[PDB]
Design goal:
This is part of a larger assembly, with chains A (about 170 residues), B (about 160 residues), C (about 50 residues), D (about 55 residues), E (about 130 residues) and F (about 60 residues).
Chain A: H1 2-11, H2 23-38, H3 41-54, H4 62-77, H5 87-107, H6 112-135, H7 137-147, H8 151-155, H9 162-168
Helix pairs in contact in A: 1-4, 4-5, 5-6, 5-7, 6-7
Chain C: H1 3-8
Chain F: H1 11-46, H2 54-63
The chains are: A mainly alpha (about 170), B alpha+beta (about 160), C little secondary structure (about 50), D mainly alpha (about 55), E alpha+beta (about 130), F mainly alpha (about 60).
The complex binds magnesium ion (3 copies).
One magnesium ion binds near residues 124 and 127 of chain A.
Chain A binds three RNA strands through helix 4, helix 5 and helix 6.
Family (chain A): Belongs to the universal ribosomal protein uS15 family.
Keywords (chain A): Mitochondrion, Ribonucleoprotein, Ribosomal protein, RNA-binding, rRNA-binding, Transit peptide
Protein name (chain A): Small ribosomal subunit protein uS15m
RNA sequence: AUAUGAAUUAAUGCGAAGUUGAA
RNA sequence: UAAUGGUUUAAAGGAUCCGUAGAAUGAAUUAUAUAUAAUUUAGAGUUAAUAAAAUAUAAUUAAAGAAUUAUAAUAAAUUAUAAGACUAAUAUAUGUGAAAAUAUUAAUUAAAUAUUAACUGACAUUGAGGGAUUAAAACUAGAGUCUAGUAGUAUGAAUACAAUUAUUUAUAAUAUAUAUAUAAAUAAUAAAUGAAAAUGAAAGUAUUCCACCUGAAGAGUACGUUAGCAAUAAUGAAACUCAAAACAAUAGACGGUUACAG
RNA sequence: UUUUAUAUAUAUAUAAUAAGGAAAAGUAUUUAUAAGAA
């Protein structure tokens, strides 16, 4: 699904900062402080390097990566800046968390608590997208196509019966 | 217009009467407001006041969507001679089985016949019927030849 | 119990009347031939032949 | 005392002296009635003491 | 991610006990830095007697050099650090505990915190630039 | 009971309310931005002490 | 398949005064 | 000729949750003809911020520890080896989890709280069928004793409301004192309910959805089917016999039932 | 409550002030109908 590909690529970009930071803004703030004193070059460079190493995705927790991914998904699907609850945004955010959970269970398969958590999340997405179908037919098909799902997946009854996992080779 | 909300209101008035509270509150919806007005005009409730969840309104407040969530209708209960005036309140038309009666069967009910397993009107009793989104006493509904849904029974 | 459960089949127990003379196939009487005549003792407290 | 001053006992997991201040001669964690700490403070003190025992300090 | 390592190194040379601590610290710091890590602090806890005669491999120790190294590093790399420590003859014991950086980015070591220094800024008293 | 229960808001009121709500949200963003910038500021302040250079690793090992 | 009969055969109900265990 | 019935204890709440259909039920305002359309935010949700150990819950990996067992040595004892299982205080299962369960340490991943702000705009409740996990036991295959299994046993949920007191518990204040207010937990109540025992913020007042019960025994038996190599499990009667049978409580004599006296 | 007055920085703290008083005599049909005992 191209959307998921781009979102999961943004995490693995060569340099992307955590905790809400980006390279441009940190650069601005660092240069501004450096200028402030005016009114050895090696040390400031390696100090900058240490800062950037501290704030790196590769350094931070996976939870932070998923937080950033959810932010990107919301930014993409939002009706207007700041929108968070329109069913498109809800579907996208739950989709990202579903991807993360599916990875989690795929790694180790006896974790039944998180398995039922994931099933509940999937069924929640089904419910919200069904409501979207009823309310906004156009945005509904737009959304299921972007997220990589046909109407069959949303409409039908779904559970992760192990036969599902055998069918789609989930493990 | 929920019969669920109206049933909750009916049970709330019953409980408030049993523990002898002078003033209580109900949801501020037109069904509840029409209900409270019809009970009040018949002497069952002492008074109606506008208010919020905290209490009755001190000064007049306009009703807007901004404050609608916390709006409440404060009903004052009557207790006379150490007894509750509004002794009991019931819903004839349950949310499952809704009873929409034509005028002839309302006359039969008022005249003592049991229609659709509804116990007929009693002397000191009050029955409310909603016709075309207006609540009214069953007697007035018959007087205006209005077909309607029978809702409740307060004795 | 609930209106749908009542609708789906539940209800008061059928006050079912079974025949106390099943072999008479709903006839007031039936003719018959006596294979044997037998003397029996009733259940106590009663005693007799 | 000091963990009754609003400090976090988990922070005192690399300071075996203070952890020893709240154990019996044989090393037994002192029940809450003896220590008189809050619940939450007692739980972090127990966790910190058991961590200290785990890391060999 | 912050991780405090508390290592217990064996004293085999009685005249210069500290050398093994220096060599292990150098090796681990090289791993951390060369793997896109940072070693924020090294606290040299003194030489102390062990609570018991604790045994690693065949040799038995009674006293050791304790040290604390606070470092910001990634998960796989701390896993490899621990694997190296456990298989290293010099390290009697190791313990690597995460320090949550959720609320503040810069945080001190457990001992300096226990004194009352929740961040290394208070450790190195003041910076003295504003706005 | 005949009159409408509530007076629906005119679109001018809707625009004004939009302005107030967006002000609240943007103010929260502004506080969070101040906080992240201040944390970055303190991090860079004390980043002198941190050790990213092996040449400095040996220095501080010898010092300590 | 719907029935009707069957040597051979499974279980259980009753009752007669009792017989044996101590669950 | 009693369902103007019941399910803690008389027959009967399904182990726990998730959720499809429901010819099941379900927010607010306006307008039009019993719904439809447009608006709205009280239900249900989404994203952040803060506070808190979200520590306990799962899986995985990596460690620690007492002792046990066996082997070897020295003269039950002291050392040295390997093996596994278990987690001694804290300690209350306080808590966490839907239940079953779970308290030696660290880490990785996942999830669970509240309040505020913003956003969606009824997207909700329950849930037949179905699906997940399901102790111990039973055995089946692949691997060298282990893994992968078959199988599925052994006071329902939600919403509105409901007088006190006394303790705690967690916050919010005001200057230890306001014997401080707001909440939840615990105990005795009032009213109310009940056949009573007893319940007493639920076994109360109401609404909605599902499951279950219809005298005792025959019988959870037989037969058939369903899965299973099988074991077993699920579904599950009928004839005959009887006026019984059962529950709570009352007084009694009875027990090696308890003590205690005279 | 409301209205004003002073003071202070359109607003805030203080002081005063309050319009709701009317009387009169006479002017049935009720409806359908559910019992238990051993
Ligand atoms: Mg849902
Ligand atoms: Mg009848
Ligand atoms: Mg029973």
């Amino acid at each position: 699904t191209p959307f998921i590909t781009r979102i999961m690529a943004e995490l693995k970009e060569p340099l992307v900062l955590s905790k809400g930071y980006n390279i441009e803004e940190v650069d601005k703030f660092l240069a501004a402080i450096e200028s402030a004193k005016r009114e050895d070059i090696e040390k400031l460079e390696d100090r900058r390097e240490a800062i950037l190493r501290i704030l790196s995705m590769r350094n931070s927790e996976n939870k932070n990566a998923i937080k950033m991914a959810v932010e990107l998904a919301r930014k993409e699907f939002e009706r207007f800046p700041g929108d968070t609850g329109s069913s498109e945004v809800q579907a996208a955010c739950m989709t990202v968390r579903i991807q993360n959970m599916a990875n989690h269970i795929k790694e180790h398969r006896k974790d039944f608590a998180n398995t039922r958590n994931l099933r509940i999340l999937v069924q929640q997405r089904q419910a919200i997208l069904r409501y979207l179908k009823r309310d906004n037919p156009e945005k509904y098909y737009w959304t299921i196509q972007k997220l990589g799902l046909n109407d069959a997946a949303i409409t039908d009854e779904f559970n992760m019966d192990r036969r599902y996992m055998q069918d789609y080779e989930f493990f | 217009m929920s019969l669920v909300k109206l049933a909750n209101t009916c049970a709330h008035l019953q409980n408030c009467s049993k523990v002898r509270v002078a003033l209580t509150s109900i949801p501020y919806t037109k069904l509840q407001l029409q209900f409270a007005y019809n009970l009040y005009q018949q002497g069952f409730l002492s008074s109606l006041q506008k208010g919020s969840t905290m209490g009755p309104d001190k000064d007049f407040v306009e009703v807007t969507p901004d404050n609608i969530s916390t709006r409440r209708l404060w009903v004052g209960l009557k207790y006379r001679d150490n007894k509750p005036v509004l002794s009991s309140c019931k819903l004839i038309s349950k949310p499952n089985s809704r009873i929409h009666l034509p005028m002839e069967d309302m006359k039969k009910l008022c005249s003592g016949v049991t229609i659709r397993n509804i116990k007929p009107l009693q002397p000191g009793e009050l029955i409310l019927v909603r016709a075309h989104n207006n609540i009214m006493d069953i007697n007035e509904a018959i007087s205006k030849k209005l077909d309607g849904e029978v809702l409740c029974r307060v004795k | 119990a609930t209106l749908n459960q009542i609708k789906r089949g539940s209800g008061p127990p059928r006050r079912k009347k079974i025949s106390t003379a099943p072999q008479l196939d709903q006839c007031p009487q039936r003719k018959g031939v006596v294979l044997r005549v037998m003397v029996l003792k009733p259940k106590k407290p009663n005693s007799a032949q | 005392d000091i963990m009754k001053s609003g400090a976090n006992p988990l922070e005192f997991y690399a300071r075996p002296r203070i952890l020893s201040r709240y154990v019996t001669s044989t090393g037994r964690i002192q029940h809450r009635d003896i220590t008189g700490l809050s619940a939450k403070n007692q739980r972090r003190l127990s966790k910190a003491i058991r961590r200290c025992q785990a890391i060999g300090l | 991610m912050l991780y405090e390592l508390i290592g217990l190194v064996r004293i085999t040379n009685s005249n210069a006990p500290k050398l093994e601590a220096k060599e292990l610290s150098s090796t681990i710091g090289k791993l951390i830095i060369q793997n896109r890590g940072v070693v924020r602090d090294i606290v040299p806890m003194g030489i102390r007697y062990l609570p018991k005669i604790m045994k690693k491999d065949q040799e038995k120790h009674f006293r050791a050099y304790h040290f604390l190294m606070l470092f910001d590093s990634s998960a796989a790399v701390q896993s490899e650090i621990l694997r190296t420590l456990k298989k290293d003859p010099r390290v009697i014991r190791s313990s690597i505990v995460k320090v949550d950086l959720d609320k503040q980015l810069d945080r001190a070591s457990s001992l300096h915190r226990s004194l009352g220094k929740k961040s290394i800024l208070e450790l190195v008293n003041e910076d003295y630039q504003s706005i | 009971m005949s009159q409408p229960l509530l007076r629906n808001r005119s679109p001018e009121e809707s625009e004004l309310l939009k302005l107030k709500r967006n002000y609240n949200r943007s103010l929260l963003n502004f506080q969070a931005h101040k906080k992240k910038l201040n944390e970055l500021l303190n991090l860079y302040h004390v980043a002198n002490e941190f050790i990213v250079t092996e040449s400095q690793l040996l220095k501080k090992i010898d010092k300590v």
